[PDB]
Design a protein around this nucleic acid. Structure first.
Ligand SMILES: Nc1ccn([C@H]2C[C@H](O)[C@@H](COP(=O)(O)NP(=O)(O)OP(=O)(O)O)O2)c(=O)n1
Ligand SMILES: [Mn+2]
Length: 427
DNA sequence: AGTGTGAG
DNA sequence: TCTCACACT
């Protein structure tokens, strides 16, 4: 049987990233219930990032800041920079590149979102083991590490138990077996302590991190002791960890597919999947998903961490909901121009920084009365980083979905507009 | 090429 | 009352 202990993978995840980005810049928000918001007027603005101090009051993402203040009257607020009538995120993107560059010193990273990356440390863990000759690993090398499932067997303060668990782990490590997977997880955990130290001292940002054998475990582990902590999930921890883990908490099972794992099969927790055969799971979810599910519930995944530190697409979008929808040709032309303009800005910066040019532009629009995020999506060529050409071209390739017989109106009204650069080529 | 899913 | 990765057809 193949064990899934072949690689060492980590998932680093910035803590309340936007909140942190504003908190480094405005010291007045430090160590304070605090949230980041976009578009100030409707209900104070929508909250997309919450200080941990603020979360103790109930404040969550996707809350109207006015409601947020009903839970947390001293909630402090930063607002996302607006430009061209639109939210602009350049500060967090640039903040992100700060972090990704420091991470890259240690291994190749797969940028996963603006604020989290997977790491393959399999080989860096190798090298460290040789240089370790054979000497053990003192717990002083893992000041923020938690070992999931420990302590076991025969202190009530949160970090007090963290030390006893970390002691049990080390106390049973076969330091001499260079091929021992648990040993390599330990060595990985040591590296990311360093990696995390370097991020904090060189940017001021704190994050969390999971260390395990694939990306799904690393991601689930990283959540286990947020914030400013890092968790090691061993192959051995999985049966217990998964015995009560709701299926929806495993990455890619949060949506409809995980919903049908529950009702079809009639279970609640990841561990309950081991009683099914692969052919059984393939019967229900296709041959890729059953294969993926039969392994995953035993803690096995092979989705590699790809070498990809830059986004694969540069994209701009704005919604125009309610009666703010767009019912005029000139109105439609003006927001495309705005969007194309930010696009042109960001594109030019890309071409200079990463020696690459986008060759294909995707324009997409939603109409009031539809209910899927995209009503429509059609592509067109992108030959010049020129805001006027692109906005012109984007029109042409959507003009004909104006149902209204009169020229200067747009029926039905547009409630979403989207420009996106893609199909990159080295430059 | 064009849609839907999942996620931050 | 945004963003961007990916699988499928
Ligand atoms: N639905 C979402 C999720 C995230 N974001 C943005 C703002 C978030 O600070 C940033 C990363 O979000 P996140 O990783 O889901 N959790 P965020 O760093 O607030 O804090 P933690 O929950 O990781 O502590 O993406 C967003 O704009 N809309
Ligand atoms: Mn985060």
């Amino acid at each position: 049987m193949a064990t899934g202990q072949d690689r060492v993978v980590a998932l680093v995840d910035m803590d309340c990233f936007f909140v942190q980005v504003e908190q480094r810049q405005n010291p007045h928000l430090r160590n304070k219930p605090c949230a980041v918001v976009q578009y100030k007027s409707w209900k104070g603005g929508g909250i997309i990032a919450v200080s941990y101090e603020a979360r103790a009051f109930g404040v969550t993402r996707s809350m109207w800041a006015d409601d947020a203040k009903k839970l947390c009257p001293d909630l402090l607020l930063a607002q996302v920079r607006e430009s061209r009538g639109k939210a602009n995120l350049t500060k967090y993107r640039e903040a992100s590149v700060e972090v990704m560059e420091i991470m890259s010193r240690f291994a190749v990273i797969e940028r996963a979102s603006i604020d989290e990356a997977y790491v393959d440390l399999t080989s860096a863990v190798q090298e460290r083991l040789q240089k370790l000759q054979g000497q053990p690993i003192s717990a002083d090398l893992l000041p923020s590490t938690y070992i999931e499932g420990l302590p076991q067997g025969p202190t009530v303060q949160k970090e007090g138990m963290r030390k006893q668990g970390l002691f049990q782990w080390l106390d049973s490590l076969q330091i001499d077996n260079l091929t021992s997977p648990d040993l390599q997880l330990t060595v990985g955990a040591v590296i990311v302590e360093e990696m995390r130290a370097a991020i904090e001292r060189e940017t001021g940002f704190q994050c969390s991190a999971g260390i395990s054998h694939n990306k799904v475990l690393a991601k689930l582990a990283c959540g286990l002791n947020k914030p400013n902590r890092q968790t090691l999930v061993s192959h051995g921890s999985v049966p217990q960890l998964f015995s009560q883990m709701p299926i929806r908490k495993i990455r890619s099972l949060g949506g409809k597919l995980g919903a049908s794992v529950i009702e079809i099969l009639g279970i609640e927790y990841m561990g309950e999947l081991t009683q099914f055969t692969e052919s059984q799971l393939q019967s229900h979810f296709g041959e890729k998903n059953g294969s993926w599910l039969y392994a995953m519930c035993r803690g096995i995944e092979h989705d590699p961490v790809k070498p990809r530190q830059l986004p694969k697409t540069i994209g701009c979008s704005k919604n125009f909901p309610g009666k703010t929808a767009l019912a005029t040709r000139e109105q439609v032309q003006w927001w495309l121009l705005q969007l194309a303009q930010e696009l042109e800005e960001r594109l030019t910066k890309d071409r200079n920084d990463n020696d690459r040019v986008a060759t294909q532009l995707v324009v997409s629009i939603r109409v009031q009365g539809d209910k899927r995020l995209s009503s429509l999506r059609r592509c067109c060529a992108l030959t010049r980083y020129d805001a006027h050409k692109m906005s012109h071209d984007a029109f042409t390739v959507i003009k004909n979905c104006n149902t209204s017989g009169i020229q200067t109106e747009w029926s039905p009204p547009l409630t979403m507009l989207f420009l996106c650069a893609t199909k990159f080529s080295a430059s």
